[PDB]
C-alpha cells in the first residue's frame, strides 16, 4: 500500500528484492514472524533519488500492528539508518512480534534520505488473539525489567495534568473576577491599574517562584531516581557488509523492449549467451516486485504474494536448454494482470521510459544464475 501510485520506473530501477521468505502466514499475539531476503541497489539508480547514503530498513504496515523486535542488514543489527552502496546486494532479516489482531499486508521497505519510501513486495499476514495479551518486556542495564507498552505512562500523565492544572489555576484565579467588557472599559477612559494590585501581585510571584521551585525540585528528584541515563543513541551506521556474489555465467543483451498501450504485457528481445558449463534455461523475470515465471522451468514454493506471482507469466520464444558456449536471440514476453494491477503500465506517464529487472537462469541440476537487465522500454499503440 503506497507503491502502485508511485512512478513505475522508480519502482523498477531503484531496489530489487529477491529470495524473500516469511516464516509464518498466521500468527498469534506476542508471536514472532521473521522476514528474510536480499536486495540489490540498482546500478542505474535514478537522479532525483538521493543516493542511499542514509537509508533506513523499515517495515510497511498500518502502524504497530506488529512491533519490530530486530532487524539485520548483513550480519549486523540495524536500529539506526545505514549507508548502502549503489551496485551492491545485501541480505536482510526483519523480526516482528504481533501486536494487533487482524489482517495485515506487511511489506519490507527502505527509507531514503532525500525523497522516497522504497516499498518492496507486500505479503498478507494474519494476527489472531487479543491486544490485551501483548507484552513488550525489556531489561535495562540498570537492573529493572519493564513493559514498554505502559512504561512511564502514569508518570507522563501526572506531570502533564499537574502542569495543566496550574495553567488552569492561574487563569482560574483571574476569572473569579469579570474578564472582558468591564476591564476593557476601565483601561479605556481613565487608567487601568485599579484592575490589579497585591494581593494580586503577591499571587503573581507566588506562582512565579513556586514554578521555578517545583521545576528544579522535580528535576533533581528525577535525577535522584534514575541516576543512570544516556543520550538518545543515533547516527548512520557505515560499513554495511554486502553479499559476495559469484560472477554470473550467462550474459544477456536487450535489443528493443516494448509494451502495448493499453495492455498487460511487456515484450523484450534478448540475446542470451551461455558462458560457463551446463545447459541453461530461463526461469524468471523479476521486475517491480512482480515475478514472471516459466513454469515449464521454475516453480515458486516460498508462497510469494499471490497477486505478484505470475505462475506461467513468462514465455520465451525458444526455452530449450541453451548449450554451454552457445548464444541465441530469443523473444520474451512477461504477461500478467499484475502488470496492470500494480500499474507498471503507468510507466507511460513517467519522464523516463526505461525499465530494469532481474532474470534468473537455471541449469540442469537446478542451480541458478542471476543477471540483471535494464534498457529503454518503448510503448507501441498502433
Amino acid at each position: 500500500h503506497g507503491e502502485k501510485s508511485q512512478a513505475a520506473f522508480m519502482r523498477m530501477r531503484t531496489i530489487h528484492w529477491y529470495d524473500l521468505s516469511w516464516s509464518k502466514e498466521k500468527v498469534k499475539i506476542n508471536e514472532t514472524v521473521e522476514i528474510k531476503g536480499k536486495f540489490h541497489v540498482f546500478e542505474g539508480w535514478p537522479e532525483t533519488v538521493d543516493e542511499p547514503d542514509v537509508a533506513f530498513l523499515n517495515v510497511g504496515m498500518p502502524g504497530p500492528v506488529f512491533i519490530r523486535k530486530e532487524s539485520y542488514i548483513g550480519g549486523q543489527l540495524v536500529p539506526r539508518s545505514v549507508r548502502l552502496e549503489i551496485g551492491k546486494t545485501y541480505d536482510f532479516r526483519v523480526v516482528l512480534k504481533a501486536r494487533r489482531p487482524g489482517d495485515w499486508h506487511v511489506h519490507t521497505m527502505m527509507n531514503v534520505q532525500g525523497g522516497g519510501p522504497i516499498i518492496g513486495p507486500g505479503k498478507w499476514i494474519t494476527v489472531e488473539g487479543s491486544m490485551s495479551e501483548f507484552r513488550n518486556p525489556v531489561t535495562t542495564l540498570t537492573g529493572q525489567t519493564v513493559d514498554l507498552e505502559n512504561y512511564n505512562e502514569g508518570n507522563t500523565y501526572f506531570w502533564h495534568a499537574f502542569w495543566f492544572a496550574i495553567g488552569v489555576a492561574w487563569i482560574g484565579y483571574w476569572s473569579r473576577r469579570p474578564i472582558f467588557i468591564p476591564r476593557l472599559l476601565m483601561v479605556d477612559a481613565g487608567r487601568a491599574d485599579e484592575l490589579v494590585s497585591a494581593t494580586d501581585r503577591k499571587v503573581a510571584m507566588g506562582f512565579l517562584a513556586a514554578t521555578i521551585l517545583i521545576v528544579v525540585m522535580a528535576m533533581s528528584s528525577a535525577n535522584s531516581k534514575y541516576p543512570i541515563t544516556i543520550p538518545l543513541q543515533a547516527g548512520t551506521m557505515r560499513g554495511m557488509k554486502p553479499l559476495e556474489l559469484p560472477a554470473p555465467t550467462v550474459s544477456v543483451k536487450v535489443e528493443d523492449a516494448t509494451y502495448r498501450v493499453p495492455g498487460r504485457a511487456m515484450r523484450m528481445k534478448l540475446t542470451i549467451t551461455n558462458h560457463g558449463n551446463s545447459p541453461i534455461r530461463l526461469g524468471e523475470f523479476y521486475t517491480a516486485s512482480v515475478r514472471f515465471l516459466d513454469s515449464d522451468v521454475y516453480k515458486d514454493t516460498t508462497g510469494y504474494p499471490e497477486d505478484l506471482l505470475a505462475e506461467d507469466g513468462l514465455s520465451v520464444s525458444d526455452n530449450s536448454p541453451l548449450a554451454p558456449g552457445e548464444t541465441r536471440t530469443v523473444d520474451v514476453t512477461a504477461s500478467d494482470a499484475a502488470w496492470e494491477v500494480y500499474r507498471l503500465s503507468d510507466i507511460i506517464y513517467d519522464p523516463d521510459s526505461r525499465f530494469a529487472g532481474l532474470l534468473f537462469f537455471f541449469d540442469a541440476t537446478g542451480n541458478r544464475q542471476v543477471v540483471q537487465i535494464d534498457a529503454p522500454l518503448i510503448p507501441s499503440f498502433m
Binding site: 498500518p62 536500529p79 505512562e153 502533564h160 501581585r201 535525577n223
Partner: protein, 218 residues
Amino acid sequence: AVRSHAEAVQVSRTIDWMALFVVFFVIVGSYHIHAMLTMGDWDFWSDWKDRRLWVTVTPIVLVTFPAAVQSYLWERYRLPWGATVCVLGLLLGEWINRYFNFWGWTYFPINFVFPASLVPGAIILDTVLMLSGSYLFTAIVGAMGWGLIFYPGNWPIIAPLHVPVEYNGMLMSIADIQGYNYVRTAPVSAFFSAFMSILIYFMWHFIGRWFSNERFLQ
C-alpha cells in the same frame, strides 16, 4: 436597554464565558496549525525529544503566540494570562489528538507519542510581564526564562525514557527502543534557545500590535 446595573453584570458575565470560549478555541486552532506547520515533528515522538534540536527549536518557535496575545490581553485588559492560555490551548488540542488518534485511531502507545510540557515557561512569561509591566523587560528576562526552563521542565517526564539498555548488543536508551519497536513510516542548546526567544518575543510583540488593530475599510 439595559434595565438594571445588576442585569448588566449578568450580561458582561455571560459574555465573559462566551468570549473566553472564542478566544480559547481560535487560539487552539491557529496555534496548533503553527506548531504543526513549522515542525514535521519532534513533538510526536519520544525518540525525537533530543538534547540539541528539540531543546532549541521548540521554545523558539513557540514563544510567538504567547508574545502576540500577551501584547493584547495585558495592554488592553490587564489580563496577565496571555501566555498561559496559548500554551494550554496547544496542549489540550494535542492531547485530545494524541489520545483519540495517535492511540485511538492508529495504535501508538501514549508513553511514546506524548507531547512536550509547556506551562512552566508560560507562567514565567505571564508573571514576569505582570510584575514590572514592561514588555521590553519580558522580552529579555521573560523570554530568557521561557527558553531556559523548557528542558528542565520536561526532564521529569523524559528521564525515565533515558535509562540505558543493551538491546541485542547495542546500547540504546528506552526511548530509542520505543521508536525502533513501534513502527512509523547540550544546555548551551537551552541558552541559545533563550537568546533566540528574545528576538522572537520581540518581533512578535509588534506583530500582535497589528492583529489588535481596530480599523474599518471601504
